Amino acid sequence: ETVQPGDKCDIVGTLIVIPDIAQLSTPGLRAETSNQSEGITGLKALGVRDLTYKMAFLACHIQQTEYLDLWSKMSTEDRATLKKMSDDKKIEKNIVDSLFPNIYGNHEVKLGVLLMLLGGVAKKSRDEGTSLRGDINVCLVGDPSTAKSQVLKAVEEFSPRAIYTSGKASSAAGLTAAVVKDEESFEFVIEAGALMLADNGVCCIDEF
Amino acid sequence: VCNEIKVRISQLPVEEDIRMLRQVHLNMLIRTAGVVTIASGILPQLAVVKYDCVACGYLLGPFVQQNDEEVRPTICPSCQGKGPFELNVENTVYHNYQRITMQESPNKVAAGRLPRSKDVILLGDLCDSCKPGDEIEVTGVYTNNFDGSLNYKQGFPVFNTLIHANHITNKDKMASDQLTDEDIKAIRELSQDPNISQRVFSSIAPSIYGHDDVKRAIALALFRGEALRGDINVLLCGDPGTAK
Amino acid sequence: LFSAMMVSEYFSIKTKNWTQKGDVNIRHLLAQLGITLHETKQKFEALPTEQRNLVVDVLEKEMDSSFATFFGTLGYCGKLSACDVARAVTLRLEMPKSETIMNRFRSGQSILRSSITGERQDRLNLNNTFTSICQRTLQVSWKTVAAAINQSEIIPNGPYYLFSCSRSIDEDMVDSRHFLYNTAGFMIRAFASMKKGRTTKPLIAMFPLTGESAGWLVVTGVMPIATIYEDSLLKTCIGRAFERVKKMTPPLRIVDDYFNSDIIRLKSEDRTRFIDFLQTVFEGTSN
Amino acid sequence: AFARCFKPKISDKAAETLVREYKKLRMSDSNNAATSSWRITVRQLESLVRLSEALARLHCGKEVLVEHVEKAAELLNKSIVR
Amino acid sequence: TGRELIAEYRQLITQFRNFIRDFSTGGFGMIYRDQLKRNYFSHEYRLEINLNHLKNFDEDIEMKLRKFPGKVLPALEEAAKIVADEITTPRPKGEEKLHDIQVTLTLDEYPTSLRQVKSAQVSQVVKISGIIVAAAQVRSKATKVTLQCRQCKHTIPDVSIKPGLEGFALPRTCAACPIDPYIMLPDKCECVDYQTLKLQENPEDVPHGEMPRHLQLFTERYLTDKVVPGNRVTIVGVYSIKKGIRTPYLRVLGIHMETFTTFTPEEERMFKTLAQRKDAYELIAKSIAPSIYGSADIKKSIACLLFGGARKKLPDGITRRGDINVLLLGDPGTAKSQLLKFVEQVSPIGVYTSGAMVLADGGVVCIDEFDKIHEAMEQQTISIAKAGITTTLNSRCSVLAAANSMPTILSRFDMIYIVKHDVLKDATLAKHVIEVHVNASAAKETMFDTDGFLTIEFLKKFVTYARLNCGPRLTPQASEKLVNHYVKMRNPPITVRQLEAIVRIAESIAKMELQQFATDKHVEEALRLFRVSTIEAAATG
Amino acid sequence: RFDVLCVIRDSVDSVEDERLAKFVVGNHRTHHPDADQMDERTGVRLIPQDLLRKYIIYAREKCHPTLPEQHSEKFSNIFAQMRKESMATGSVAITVRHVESMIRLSEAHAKLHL
DNA sequence: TTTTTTTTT
Ligand SMILES: Nc1ncnc2c1ncn2[C@@H]1O[C@H](COP(=O)(O)OP(=O)(O)NP(=O)(O)O)[C@@H](O)[C@H]1O
Ligand SMILES: [Mg+2]
Ligand SMILES: [Zn+2]
């Protein structure tokens, strides 16, 4: 449980082969196929049945590929550079001109999307259970060839947890979260869709 | 009245998430919390069993019913042989049984994760004590058992796990609608004053300013006509943002 | 047994069940005596005989009274008690007042004859009489006393206490001597148990009538609790007090036709002058 | 990534400025009630507070100042006008 | 140790025989003996016993019967069989066979809550109350069976099966031959009826904000087909677990229920007295809906709708309809729905609603909100041909319709009204109606009614009497007027549909007087009603 | 099916905008995670909320108002006046349902004073 | 379960 859906990871380990263990009968276990493309034949436990195999990776190590105490801990280089950035009085222009270098004009749209990346402070009522939403929502409408898809693609490239979708190639199951059932197991399970993989992040919908 | 007094134990100091239980906690006492999603009906389960010996009429037992077994004898000692067996209707004992499913609270889940869930078993006077949707807190023993079909499902010798409940607190139990003599004296002293109608009307929703017609309609609708519908029905229509 | 206990005078005064704590008090009392709630709340016929004898012994020792009575048995039919048959006959004789006097007499005669036979229809009539009006009369009397205490209807008025209603709960029962005597005797002791010093005055009670007797009141009274009787005879003087109120001038609209002198009918308008005249009589005997 | 750990509070002059700017927005919409392309309700104040908090997070400020409310109102007006 | 159980069993049979013979209410009244004799000669092989009478006779066997019913109850049934043989011998020739008798029980106690049956009460007698929610078809269960071995053909006869929802296991190997060799003969076994029911707890006893719970019931022989869904019942039975977890069910031992076309000479004389009265038609029209003011011609029309015309079939096979149909138009108020509810209550068969058209063969349907079928009205049939189905549904009824306003379907209705400046008369009506509602608030605080109007229970019976008995025709002199009226109106929208509607109304008026024939009087009143109703639509809209 | 209908119309105003804005900003400013009373219009005392709940619970189950016959004279005349004015206006009529609603409201108002 | 296609209302 050190990793979540939507993460991108490096794994170190070994490649292994696992059998179809339901075909065998031994003391303590009879075969599930008897209770309820050609394989290997000959074993005492395989009376008439046959055995086949699947690949699997046996992980030895997994990791993802990429507050005052934390501020103290990022001590020399990060505090120097970030404090100079915080002192910069034209940081709004200097950030938007680096986030969107290929787009001319549209200063209002650039600033609004930059504020959407930061967002407000979410607050909970102390006993009612109600809450005040801190997330910001932005919509773009305009004529053909006005760089709407360019802006959305740039946001999804920059942000760490952002996802891009098209409205013509999506379903209500795949957009946010979905129900699935297993066939290794047989119980029902939940798939985290694109909105939940972009939880605490940005979901971009083109051709809404 | 009874045969045995049970001891329930509360305020155990260490809490665990459902998400964080490991093989360390097997056969240990733990406390968790969550939301009920599914509950079965109440059913009787075998507790203590005795059997007849068909060969000589001797009564075999008692056998305390274990958790996951079909307990039976094999030899009757009074005839020293493997006589046939029947269930003794007259001396078998039962108790109530229920099974529920509990999920992690949505408030406590971190970023982008899915909540986990466990099954909980209730026996005796713990049955029928909660509904789906209730925020509850459970104290019990965390245990494991083998399941060959679960082994065949996962492809590895995994084990099924459960919690046997020992104490429950339901956080969503409403307050008791019972009044003390002090409360009834306060109600009488309030009712004696002449300005009581305007007190009630204006003191409903004190943050909202004006709209005394809506306030009086709500106030007279909280009380009821005597009855032949006795209920007084109210409808509001208004522009968005008008605090309706 | 639970419903039988909760309307009696003794257990109501002991547990104060017109207040909020009554249910807790009776549950603790049953736990002390050693009787289970299920035993009290199932029907008394359903218990086994030894269990019945044990429970009756415990409650007899708790109530601590010298009462004894007669029992009649006939064949394999159920045993009856003379006290229970007396209550059934009384309530078929005296109620409702809208029926004619000969019909009420014949009804009481039929109920009395039903107790000395084993016939199914007769015993069914007797059990219906037990399980409707005999229960309902006790419940209405208890409700009257509880409402009186909880809403403070009883006031001092000089040398006596006065009780008056806004409405009577059931006007068919108000004109019965059994109802009036039992309710007033319960009410004075319930009122005197709440606070000290209330034992030395009589109580006067008034009930209103509506319909064909609209504008009339039924009036009766009970002697003080602290009175000492020189022997067992239970002498009273409140009917004599009402009778001497009637002789005063200018006259009042009093009806005095009953064979019992301590029950009268009074016009609603003459209530104030009646209160003043009765106070004059009790003060003139105090002098 | 660093700036989103900040949780700025609302200062007194910022609260006064929020009241004044909400009044300005609703007044101008009422002056152009038959011709404005989009209505103004209570929800715009929620959006204004969110934009002010985001600007405070951009400048790493520990409190919302007057300037954050002013520039949030300016950006909101420039988005609205149609 | 089987001889000890035999001694116990024969002792129980002796005691139950003594109970059935000796219990008495005094005198020569041995009630169970007399009831058993009367049932046996009525060919009902059953008996019913009160457990409190049994407790007074002997407490011990009653206590044993409650706590061990599966052991003790067959002894009681056997004792009943023995006593019946003693009572009825010597039986006549052809009746020598001794029958088998079912014993049922009653018990006077408070019922147990269905949520509060303790687990200690398994295999004990309990009393439960509830509502029957479902009832399955009757099926057969085997009581005694004959077994035969597959290979060597050795037999085991009269193997008896225990009651309830219990199976039984066959012998594993031959008694005189592989694994499981015995088979069951279909021809040499005994069978009895059984039925399964489902019981719901009473909605009064459900705790606040919860759904009711359910229990399954098993019934046998004379206790089958006694109940229908919706019935309220109290049941005495054994609490059983169905064959470490099991589901429960109740095996029923006793059920207690908690709940036209035939006339007397008194009823016939009452009907004929009303028919002999001169003001009978006006009296019935006044008796329709007395709580609603005015509307005299509309009430007369509703009386004509209730009684209807005659129904005819000529030698060529073409039938002629007897039903009559009425439509109401105008403002949505003025107690139209209350009039429809009154007709629903008074009619011998009928339905109120906003398919539904089918369900009233010989009855009356009231349709509210009609602005929401032409084949149904004229042909008394609807038809369909969609993908993969073609059928016709046929049913005969009269229709009363209320609208709030197609010109096409107006041809299908015999009478039409427009209900439509009341305020001065409405002041007196407001005084009367508000006095009625304040008197209803004060209330909140058998031919005739007290006010001279006819009662519903008499009116419904009288309509059901008249429909099956009157069947009138027209006189020739009555027929002569309609021809001249038709020709004059048509040659000064006149159609044969309207002519036949007028004929039906005249027959309907003559039906109420219990006449052999209709005359010029009934024709003239029918013409007045037709003009007053129909010409409103010609004048308006 | 509704005894009472109500309209809540929007209106632009400096004073109501100020009261609403100050209330909402106060809600944010106090719900940040680390961060005898009388009515204005009348001076009339408020009731504590749980005591008002207990008041309603007692009044529902321990009080049952009676209705004497004499008030029919007021209800009937006012109904006849209202219905006559509505029908003469040529509008939606006032009917017997409104008499029912008036009786229900009077009973509830009696229950308020117990 | 969810997804994709062709006939029917
Ligand atoms: N302000 C701009 N600066 C630079 N390139 C621009 C600008 N506006 C439009 N373009 C160009 O317009 C082309 C279309 O961009 P695109 O992202 O598809 O806009 P769009 O509005 O989403 N088109 P469409 O999806 O059909 O509505 C690209 O080649 C962009 O480089
Ligand atoms: Mg694009
Ligand atoms: Zn043995």
Ligand SMILES: [Zn+2]
């Ligand atoms: Zn064989």
